[PDB]
DNA sequence: TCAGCAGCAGCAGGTACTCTTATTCAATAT
RNA sequence: CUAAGAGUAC
DNA sequence: ATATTGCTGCTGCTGCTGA
């Protein structure tokens, strides 16, 4: 999958890539790269799940439906995956690069937040930092969502509090 | 003449929607006139030069027997199409005096672009004659044929009284429909008149609601 | 085991949380939203350290949307009710010809796009053709409107001398420097408008400063010492109006300073007691003593005063420039998530030094003064900045950077001073002020003996460090300052970190490159042009996260949870 | 994200080229997305030009081509070949559109599509009334004309249509033998809402048109249709994450 | 108007 | 466009219509300086700008360690080593085509295929 | 509005 | 008028 | 019977629950 | 009493 | 010597001759 992403990058840099109707060249390139990386992680996770025996305890819990999912097995055993902030890959916080350990204009999967290591194998420092950015996004989203849902729920309940079914079946 | 072709096609669609509106209002319009084909319309209401004519496109309608039995206080109706893009005061005055002298309780005016406010002010004529103005662009597509739009049926006075009696309702306790709603304009609702709305529910097959015009 | 670093006010241990703020004397350009009539705004929060220390914001705004035809640039001078056109400002500073003004703003004759975008300004300002007339125009637009006609000029001159770009100078006779800086600001604004550079990132940690106990107490004492000196005057004038003998003991009032400082440290409200409800709150907090690590993390805490109820998420997100300076996973999890941060283990904050010796060094080493700089005769010249003040230009910046680096690495220049060379932008920025957050790194040199890049530090230095540590548990002591003074390690802040290439580990990245399948997958980066090396990656974590075992085998929110939950752990907080 | 959905006429649902025709018909394109650049030159006489590049263009057009009242100032527009390629536009169409939008007040000529450079030359015809101050601002007048010719005029499509994309959906059509078979159709998704003008475009199915903006649905179709659209939007929100809520609550 | 709800005018 | 300035007071010159000779003129707005017109172009507006993509190239661009290196053919020196960077035009619709500067000749060559 | 969600206006 | 309260006219 | 334009200015912010800490001065007259 | 801060479960 | 007083959300009018 990394080789496929490299080939797509080579085509894009040679301008031979044609833009999808309705978006710019860069957006089409990013869409293709993200799709390839996501399907790579899914395929690796499917291989890992198929390998696991019926006596595997995590497999048993997933089979029962008590706890866990396929994505958890994939991330713990096969590959953590692609880290995203605001629905996009890790942005260039520095000038044209994500971290000062990469060169300028690096669009490779490892440069913009693809974590190819599982949790069992452990994360390299750059992958660790990108994962921290993603987790921070998740925490902020949860903290915003709870307050927004509380406000909306109060307003809805106040609006509809007086609606009742009467004895002629009208509401 | 691609512009002329699109103009005549749009005019034909507008004519079809106007006939459909008049038929739905409860007047005697035969089904054949509604479904008139394009070639027949071009042969009849368009000249040899290709420019459609609007003066002979106007027509008159009368209530049917069932509507007379149900609505015994409504009579003949007149529909007029104008030629000039902006209808002047003189033309509107001729239209209103013709409506008055022909004893029509309702008359629909159709215009190309706009009505000057100097004529908009005199649009409300001497009662009980009511003037309703429509735009051709707004009448190209019959909105009532959209699947989102359910069935609207105007209720008679006796039906409204029975409805309020059976449900023990006051006038204001009914759901409201504005007297500018596109279907309300289509059916010519006046304030105080109740439309029954038949809807295809998904919990029951049929659901009947009611909306009072405001 | 107690580390200090806190005050004892009324028997209570109080710690001053670091306060994050936007850096001063930096030109920042921001795009504006569609509804606003101004499209781009270039602003500088000018402030002088050795003076009134008053904040005066200059905004050079660009009116008109993209599709609009009248695109005029207007500046917002302080104490003026209207946004004066920029060309009027140049004419008031003493630059009458339009050719000179356009030379000051634009540095390239071939850049006809900028001239096309800038012509509406001179078209608008054609009505004024004289310096005295321009000063009269500014006075007429002057918001005071309480001055007679021929005395408006004095008010306009005072505005342009003491309120316009105070960080350059407050004296008279330095109009050319201020005109050059205004041209530079407008040049940056137009570069952003011309779709040549992106709008400045508000979250860039190199554009932020942390006020520690020092500056906070400094500005608090100034207000308190101003009140005392003013009170001496009212007494001196009263005791001189009554014709009585003056005694110094009666004039002074120690309760003023004492009570003000005690109240400001006892309560979070940071200022005067009557100025409460308008002063920042929560600056000083009761020191946490539940556990030792809780005390440490509290003593290394930074707060960002953005609302906390605001619904914007960008200030809270973990920025890229936070690498190695704040802990990636050590934030509170409620409404202060991301707004409250914790320093990394090895990150430091500068205390500030005097910039005059560096200015003397630059003048000695061949910096051309800005007064006699003609861009046409020197097109490819590099602009040199010191603490945000444009001091001149240099024609051979490479040799200048080489000698500055050599001076800083031998101890002649203070290691806290940060020097950045932007080759693409052709700029040289030197910062010495307080508040900058930096970290140490290994320096990598050519090493012609081995023919490849290698760390400057070798086994001899490690042996000397080990010997000194063993003796502590006689030779010349080999401490951290020994490494610093011998040019083995370096201090880099987020600004300088933009212009360097760092190796994550020395073994796998410096030398030119059957593997254990259990080991994690690592890359060689296929590039050898490194300038620095990380001392250890694990130093990106803070005090609370450094307790977690195998944090890189964990999901990140779990690490954040543990960092927050280890401060509630029960143990021995002190031995006494 | 105001978006609109268009369904084609049933008789030509699977006709891909008819879908392309409808997509081109409703999509909004202006000169701003076509013109590469604009220039203002000086020509002493409006028969032979002083620019050698369009000297070939004039030895086509001036050879092909009252002229005593034409301004010496000239406005030149360079277009993009690729923009003329990915969008179904040609030189004659844009020339006709400019001539229509600026009446007779602008003498317009356009390079033929087979020329190496797509060039349009426009002069401001001089009204027979002589002007002493408009001549001085003829540069300014031509700039104003150029400004209202870049963003204020439209080549094709209805307004508020940012971008149209075509998709292949699969609906359930009752087969002539009785069953419900999977029949594919071509459906247009549109950024921007102009329901009143899109609905009347020939070639589409006016009945089945739908919009995310239930306000537009309510103000075009009615209060009942607005209620139905509101329910559909609430249902999409609820079922976006896969949750199921009984009908009566949202109703 | 006002402001709010200058003048009119000015 | 090549805007030029007066040589008497160093003030801007505006284009002007000439009646006697029917030619473009350039006039000063304060001292009335008059001279001929070098070119007929008086106004240029780029909707799609091509220049500025290679902006920022300096004689010592190779001293920047952050810039990536490559061994691609140089069609003026046939050397391998060079520094490469993407387009400097920060418009969001620009292409991802790369630019290369040889560190021994300072010739800029792109990776484009339609251009080549 | 409000606050929150003055007035308007004021 | 004016503007405000062109001309008239222009 | 119709074509062209403008002005301004204002803060709080989901539901419960636990704990700690500090709280406005100085001068004049009876 | 007021104000401020640290929190816990969502 | 002791007590009184100095990010988010909108809202509305005035005016013709000329051509
Ligand atoms: Zn001159
Ligand atoms: Zn070369």
Written account of the structure:
Chain A contains five helices and four strands; from the N terminus they run H-H-H-H-E-E-E-E-H. Chain A is mainly alpha-helical and 171 residues long. In chain A, strands 1-4 form a two-stranded antiparallel sheet. A two-stranded antiparallel sheet of chain A has the order 2-3. In chain A, helix 1 packs antiparallel against helix 2 (25-51) and helix 2 (25-51) crosses helix 4 (70-78). The N and C termini of chain A lie far apart (59 Å). Chain B is of the alpha/beta class and 214 residues long. Chain B is globular. With 576 residues, chain C is an alpha+beta fold. Chain C has four domains: 434-542, no CATH class; 5-24 and 202-212 and 271-351, no CATH class; 25-201, Dna-directed Rna Polymerase Ii 140kd Polypeptide, Chain: B, domain 3; 352-433, Hypothetical Protein Ta0175, Chain: A, domain 2 (Alpha-Beta Complex). Chain E has no helix or strand. Chains in contact: A-C, A-D, A-F, B-D, C-D, C-F, D-F. Chains A and C meet through helix 5 of A and strand 22 and helix 16 of C. One zinc ion binds at residues 6, 8-9, 11, 28, 30-31, 33 of chain F. Chain C binds three DNA and RNA strands through helix 9. The PDB classes it as transcription.
Q: In total, how many domains does the architecture of chain F comprise?
A: 2
Largest sheet of chain A: 2 strands, antiparallel
Envelope shape of chain F? elongated
Count of beta strands of chain A = 4
- Give the overall silhouette of chain A: extended
Evaluate the radius of gyration of chain A: 22 Å
Strand-residue proportion of chain F: 25-35%
Strand content of chain A: under 5%
PDB class: transcription
Keywords: 3 actd, transcription
Entry title: The structure of 3 ACTD bound to RNA polymerase II elongation complex with 4 CTG repeats.
Chains A, D: DNA-directed RNA polymerase II subunit RPB1
């Amino acid at each position: 999958a990394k080789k496929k992403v490299l080939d797509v990058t080579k085509e894009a840099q040679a301008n031979l890539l044609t833009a999808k109707h309705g978006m710019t060249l860069r957006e089409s390139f990013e869409d293709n790269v993200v799709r390839f990386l996501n399907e790579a992680r899914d395929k690796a996770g499917r291989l890992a799940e198929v390998n696991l025996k019926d006596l595997n305890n995590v497999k048993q819990m997933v089979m029962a439906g008590s706890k866990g999912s396929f994505i958890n097995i994939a991330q713990m055993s096969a590959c953590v995956g692609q880290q995203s902030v605001e629905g996009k890959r890790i942005a260039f916080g520095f000038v044209d690069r994500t971290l000062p350990h990469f060169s300028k204009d690096d669009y490779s999967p490892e440069s913009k937040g693809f974590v190819e290591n599982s949790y069992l194998r452990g994360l390299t420092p750059q992958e660790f930092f990108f994962h921290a950015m993603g987790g921070r996004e998740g925490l902020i989203d949860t903290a915003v969502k709870t307050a927004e849902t509380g406000y909306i729920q109060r307003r809805l309940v106040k609006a509809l509090e007086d609606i009742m079914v009467h004895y002629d079946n009208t509401t | 003449d691609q512009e002329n072709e699109r103009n005549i096609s749009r005019l034909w669609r507008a004519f079809r929607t106007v006939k459909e509106m008049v038929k739905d209002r409860g007047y005697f319009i035969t089904q054949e006139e509604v479904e008139l084909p394009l070639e027949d319309f071009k042969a009849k209401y368009c000249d040899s030069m290709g420019r459609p004519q609007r003066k002979m496109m106007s027509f008159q309608a009368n209530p049917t027997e069932e509507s007379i039995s149900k609505f015994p206080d409504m009579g003949s109706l007149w529909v007029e199409f104008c030629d000039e893009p902006s209808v002047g005061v003189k033309t509107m005055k001729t239209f209103v005096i013709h409506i008055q002298e022909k004893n029509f309780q309702t008359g629909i005016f159709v215009y190309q672009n706009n009505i000057t406010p100097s004529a908009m002010k005199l649009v409300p004529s001497i009662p009980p004659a009511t003037i309703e103005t429509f735009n051709e662009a707004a009448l190209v597509v019959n909105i009532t044929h959209h699947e989102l739009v359910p069935k609207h049926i105007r209720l008679s006075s006796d039906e409204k009284r029975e409805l309020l009696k059976r449900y023990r309702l006051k006038e204001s306790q009914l759901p409201r429909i504005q007297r500018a709603d596109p279907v309300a304009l289509y059916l010519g609702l006046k304030r105080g008149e109740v439309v029954k709305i038949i809807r295809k529910s998904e919990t029951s097959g049929r659901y009947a609601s009611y909306r009072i015009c405001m | 085991f107690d580390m200090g670093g806190y005050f004892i006010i009324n028997g209570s241990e109080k710690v001053l949380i670091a306060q994050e703020r936007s850096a001063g004397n930096i030109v920042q350009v921001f795009k504006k939203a569609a509804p606003s009539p101004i499209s781009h705004v270039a602003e500088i929060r000018s402030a002088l350290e050795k003076g009134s220390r008053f904040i005066s914001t200059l905004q050079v705004k660009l009116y008109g949307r993209e599709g609009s035809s009248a695109r005029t640039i207007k500046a917002t001078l302080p104490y003026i009710k209207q946004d004066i056109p920029i060309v009027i400002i140049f004419r008031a500073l003493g630059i009458i010809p339009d050719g000179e003004i356009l030379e000051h703003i634009c540095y390239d004759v071939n850049d006809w796009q900028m001239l096309e975008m800038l012509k509406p300004c001179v078209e608008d300002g054609f009505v004024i053709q004289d310096r005295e007339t321009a000063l009269d125009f500014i006075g007429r637009r002057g918001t005071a409107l309480g001055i007679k006609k021929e005395k408006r000029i004095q008010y306009a001159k005072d505005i342009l001398q003491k309120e316009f770009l105070p960080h350059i100078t407050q004296l008279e006779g330095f109009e050319s420097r201020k005109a050059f800086f205004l041209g530079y600001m407008i040049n940056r604004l137009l570069l952003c408008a011309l779709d040549r550079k992106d709008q400045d990132d508000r979250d860039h940690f190199g554009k932020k400063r942390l006020d520690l106990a020092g500056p906070l107490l400094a500005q608090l004492f100034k207000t308190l010492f101003k009140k005392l000196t003013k009170d001496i005057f009212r007494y001196m004038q009263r005791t001189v109006e009554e014709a009585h003998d003056f005694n110094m003991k009666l004039a002074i009032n120690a309760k003023t300073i004492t009570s003000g400082l005690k109240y400001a440290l006892a309560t979070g409200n940071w200022g005067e007691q009557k100025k409460a409800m308008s002063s920042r709150a929560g600056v000083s907090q009761v020191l946490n003593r539940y556990t030792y690590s809780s005390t440490l993390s509290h003593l290394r805490r930074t707060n960002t005063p953005i609302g906390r109820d605001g619904k914007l998420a960008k200030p809270r997100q973990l920025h890229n420039t936070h690498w190695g300076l704040v802990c990636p996973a050590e934030t509170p999890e409620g409404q202060a998530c991301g707004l409250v941060k914790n320093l990394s283990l090895m990150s430091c904050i500068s205390v500030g030094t005097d910039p005059m010796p560096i200015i003397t060094f630059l003048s000695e080493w061949g910096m051309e003064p800005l007064e006699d700089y003609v861009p046409h005769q020197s097109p490819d010249a590099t602009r040199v900045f010191v603490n945000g003040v444009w001091h001149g230009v240099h024609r051979n910046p490479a040799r200048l950077m080489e000698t500055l680096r050599t001076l800083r690495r031998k101890g002649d220049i203070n290691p806290e001073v940060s020097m950045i060379r932007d080759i693409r932008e052709k700029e040289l920025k030197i910062f010495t002020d307080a508040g900058r957050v930096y970290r140490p790194l290994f320096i990598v040199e050519d090493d012609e003996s081995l023919g490849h890049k290698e760390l400057k530090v070798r086994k001899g230095h490690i042996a000397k460090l080990m010997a000194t540590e063993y003796q502590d548990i006689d030779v010349e002591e080999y401490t951290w300052s020994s490494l610093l003074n011998e040019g083995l390690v370096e201090y880099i802040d987020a600004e300088e970190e933009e212009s360097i290439l760092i190796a994550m580990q020395p073994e796998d990245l410096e030398p030119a490159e059957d593997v254990d399948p259990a080991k994690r997958i690592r890359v060689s980066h296929h590039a050898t042009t490194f300038t620095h090396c990380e001392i250890h990656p694990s130093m990106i974590l803070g005090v609370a996260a450094s307790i977690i075992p195998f944090p890189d085998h964990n999901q990140s929110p779990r690490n954040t949870y543990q960092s927050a939950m280890g401060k509630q752990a029960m143990g021995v907080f002190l031995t006494n | 994200t105001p978006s609109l959905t268009v369904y084609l006429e049933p008789g030509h649902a699977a006709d891909q080229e008819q879908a392309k025709l409808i997509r081109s018909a409703i999509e909004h394109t202006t000169l701003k997305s076509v013109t590469i650049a604009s220039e203002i030159y000086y020509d002493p006489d409006p028969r032979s030009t002083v620019i050698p590049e369009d000297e070939e263009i004039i030895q086509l057009h001036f050879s092909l081509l009252s002229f005593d009242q034409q301004s010496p100032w000239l406005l030149r527009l360079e277009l993009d070949r690729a923009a003329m390629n990915d969008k179904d536009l040609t030189m004659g169409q844009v020339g006709e559109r400019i001539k229509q939008t600026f009446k007779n007040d602008l003498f317009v000529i356009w390079s033929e599509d087979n020329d190496e450079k797509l060039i349009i030359r426009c002069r401001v015809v001089r009204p027979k009334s002589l002007d002493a101050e408009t001549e001085a601002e003829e540069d300014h007048m031509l700039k104003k004309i150029e400004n209202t010719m870049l963003e204020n005029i439209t080549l094709r499509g209805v307004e508020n249509i940012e971008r149209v994309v075509m998709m292949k959906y699969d609906r359930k059509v009752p087969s002539p033998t009785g069953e419900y078979v999977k029949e594919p159709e071509w459906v247009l998704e549109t950024d921007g809402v102009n329901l009143s003008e899109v609905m009347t475009v020939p070639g589409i199915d006016p009945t089945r048109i739908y919009t995310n903006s239930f306000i537009d649905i309510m103000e075009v179709l009615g209060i009942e249709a607005g209620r139905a659209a509101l329910y559909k939007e609430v249902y999409n929100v609820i079922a976006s994450d896969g949750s199921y809520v009984n009908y009566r609550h949202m109703a | 108007t006002x402001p709010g709800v200058t003048x009119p005018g000015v | 466009t090549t805007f030029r300035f007066c040589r008497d007071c160093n003030n801007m010159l505006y284009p002007r219509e000439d009646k006697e000779n029917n030619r473009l003129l350039f006039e000063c707005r304060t001292c009335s300086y008059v001279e001929e017109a070098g070119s007929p172009l008086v106004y240029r507006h780029e909707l799609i700008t091509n220049i500025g993509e290679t902006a920022g190239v300096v004689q010592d661009i190779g001293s920047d360690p952050t810039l990536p290196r490559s061994d691609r053919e140089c069609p003026k020196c046939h050397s391998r080593e060079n520094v490469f960077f993407q387009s400097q035009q920060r418009r969001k619709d620009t292409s991802m085509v790369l630019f290369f500067v040889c560190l021994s000749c300072s010739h800029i060559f792109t990776s484009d295929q339609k251009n080549k």
